[PDB]
Amino acid sequence: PEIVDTCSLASPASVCRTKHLHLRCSVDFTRRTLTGTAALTVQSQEDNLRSLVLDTKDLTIEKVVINGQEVKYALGERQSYKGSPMEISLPIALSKNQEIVIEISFETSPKSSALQWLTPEQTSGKEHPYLFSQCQAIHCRAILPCQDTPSVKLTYTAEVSVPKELVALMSAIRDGETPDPEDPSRKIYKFIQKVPIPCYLIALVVGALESRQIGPRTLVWSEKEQVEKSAYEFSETESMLKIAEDLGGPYVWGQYDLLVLPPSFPYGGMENPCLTFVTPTLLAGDKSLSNVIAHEISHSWTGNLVTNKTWDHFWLNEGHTVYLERHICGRLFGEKFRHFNALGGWGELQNSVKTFGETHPFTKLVVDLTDIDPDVAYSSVPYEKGFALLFYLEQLLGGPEIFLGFLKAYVEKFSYKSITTDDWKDFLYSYFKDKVDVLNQVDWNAWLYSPGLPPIKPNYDMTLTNACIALSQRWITAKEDDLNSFNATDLKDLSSHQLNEFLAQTLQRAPLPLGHIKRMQEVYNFNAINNSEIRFRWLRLCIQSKWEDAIPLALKMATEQGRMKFTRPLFKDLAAFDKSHDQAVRTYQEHKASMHPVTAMLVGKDLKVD
Numbered sequence: 001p002e003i004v005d006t007c008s009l010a011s012p013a014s015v016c017r018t019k020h021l022h023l024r025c026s027v028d029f030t031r032r033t034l035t036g037t038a039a040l041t042v043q044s045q046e047d048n049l050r051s052l053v054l055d056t057k058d059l060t061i062e063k064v065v066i067n068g069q070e071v072k073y074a075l076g077e078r079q080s081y082k083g084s085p086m087e088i089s090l091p092i093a094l095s096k097n098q099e100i101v102i103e104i105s106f107e108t109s110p111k112s113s114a115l116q117w118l119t120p121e122q123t124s125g126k127e128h129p130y131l132f133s134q135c136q137a138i139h140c141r142a143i144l145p146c147q148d149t150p151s152v153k154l155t156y157t158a159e160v161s162v163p164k165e166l167v168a169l170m171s172a173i174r175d176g177e178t179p180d181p182e183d184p185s186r187k188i189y190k191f192i193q194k195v196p197i198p199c200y201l202i203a204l205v206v207g208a209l210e211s212r213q214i215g216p217r218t219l220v221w222s223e224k225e226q227v228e229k230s231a232y233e234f235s236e237t238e239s240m241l242k243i244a245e246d247l248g249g250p251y252v253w254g255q256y257d258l259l260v261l262p263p264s265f266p267y268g269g270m271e272n273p274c275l276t277f278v279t280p281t282l283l284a285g286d287k288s289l290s291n292v293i294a295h296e297i298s299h300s301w302t303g304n305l306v307t308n309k310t311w312d313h314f315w316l317n318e319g320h321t322v323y324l325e326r327h328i329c330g331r332l333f334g335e336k337f338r339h340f341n342a343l344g345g346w347g348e349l350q351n352s353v354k355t356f357g358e359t360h361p362f363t364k365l366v367v368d369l370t371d372i373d374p375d376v377a378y379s380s381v382p383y384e385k386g387f388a389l390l391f392y393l394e395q396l397l398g399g400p401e402i403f404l405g406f407l408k409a410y411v412e413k414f415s416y417k418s419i420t421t422d423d424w425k426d427f428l429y430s431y432f433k434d435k436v437d438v439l440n441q442v443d444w445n446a447w448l449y450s451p452g453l454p455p456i457k458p459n460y461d462m463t464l465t466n467a468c469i470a471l472s473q474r475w476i477t478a479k480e481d482d483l484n485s486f487n488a489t490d491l492k493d494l495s496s497h498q499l500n501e502f503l504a505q506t507l508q509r510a511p512l513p514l515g516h517i518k519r520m521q522e523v524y525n526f527n528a529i530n531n532s533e534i535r536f537r538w539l540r541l542c543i544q545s546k547w548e549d550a551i552p553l554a555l556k557m558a559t560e561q562g563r564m565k566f567t568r569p570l571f572k573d574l575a576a577f578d579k580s581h582d583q584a585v586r587t588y589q590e591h592k593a594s595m596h597p598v599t600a601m602l603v604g605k606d607l608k609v610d
């Protein structure tokens, strides 16, 4: 039953397993390098083990020490985005289950694909630099040598030396701070993660960070300028944790802290254990974007406890998390709201499938990422096709109470483990043994392995959606003589979420006539809305509908923050508009060197540069 990880060049788990990492490192802002030692505790899974291989990417290796002596190693040739395999020659052959410690001395490259280094001028405070990591999926190898596969789980401890005026945090419990004895201009911050994790959950931030308590087990961390606003925005965090624990079982990670990154953070959120990272584009002022928090919270079970064995099975992580997320929002705001969010997600799945094309391999639920960069394959598919399968199964099997019973048992069953789609399906069948006939009605081959929209669409309550659709249809069907009829009162009874969904519905039929879009600004003043989700869709609608006045607005939003969800389509839309095309390419070229490395790579590909 061989399931090897085709995104990793390291020895697989059937050969050896990393049990622990002790990281001692220093963050050198002058050189943009992290230097140090990664001591890996490795357990052989084989008799007579004499060598092993680790993943690396743009790492400089100084030496490898085992039993107090330097040992032989070799770096193989680079394999594109996978990096370079590092083979280490063990000094003494190991027995099955024998453990040794391998201490590797390394330095990262300034171009590390895991890291973004920000100058003082790129930060809020303008006086100090800043560093943040993003390891998921396969970027941990760009920080340190490791078996860079989610099929292996390890604990870790870390000591990190930084300039003394700065603060380091990690995906771990804080374990104190001291002056660095080898350099009094520096401080050492210490961390312990006692729960076994996949290495993609390793995370580091260094900057001028302050904190505020917002719940019994939560501090919010940011630069001083963002602390007050972040505390309010995310004040529902503890209530969401309590609901998540009801649904998933005990929260095992101790603290649930939040870090609000600078605007170039590439994602909305990342579920780094003990310390979720979020985008500052969540700071709407009204908590309207807090489903992202419910999402990250939910990953403390689906993803962080039960983990995809390889990235081909990423839907397990994401589909289940979206499912749990939408129940948290449903508990807080009602079942009609859960159905509204669910139906929105279907619409986003439509968009993604239309974008890739209905036969495209990246629209399958289970994907084959052999020679595919996970960053290139990344999309809403695993989120929303995954969620749709689960919601479909929920409806098939007797409803949300019953299906939540399965979700909790699933988490319990696979906690601290890494699993495949077949492990999930096998457990679903075991749990629901008395409804196997119902299960055998699902077209498993199509749902799991075929491209395109799923073979069946679930049932959705339409209550909160109907007004959005009605208003969108009024606009699309409007002729010039109907434009006068529209007025600000049209929006009176729409929540921000419904305004967003109005825009999403309308954007699905873009372009609209330019005069329509001008009238929309005239009566609805969407240019004034700072909500990032809303503004994003409004500017897309304006650019796709060829409104030249929106060009500087779209360029501004694309560059002043860097969440790929917003930055990628805005740049792509600006490139497809002949009036803005040359400026879109120029702007990307001018900014590229100060962008996040992954964002830079993907925008370049989108724009067909280099």
Ligand SMILES: C[C@H](NC(=O)[C@H](Cc1ccc(-c2ccccc2)cc1)CP(=O)(O)[C@H](C)N)C(=O)O
Pocket: 136, 266, 267, 268, 269, 270, 271, 291, 292, 295, 296, 299, 318, 563, 564, 565
């Ligand atoms: C596309 C990108 N996605 C995210 O950031 C998600 C976390 C997340 C999940 C859901 C939403 C969401 C927001 C509004 C409506 C629907 C979904 C946003 C972010 C990243 P994640 O799954 O926690 C990590 C990759 N494991 C983004 O939004 O920038």
Ligand SMILES: [Yb+3]
Pocket: 479, 481, 482
């Ligand atoms: Yb008419």
Ligand SMILES: [Zn+2]
Pocket: 295, 299, 317, 318, 321
């Ligand atoms: Zn997620």
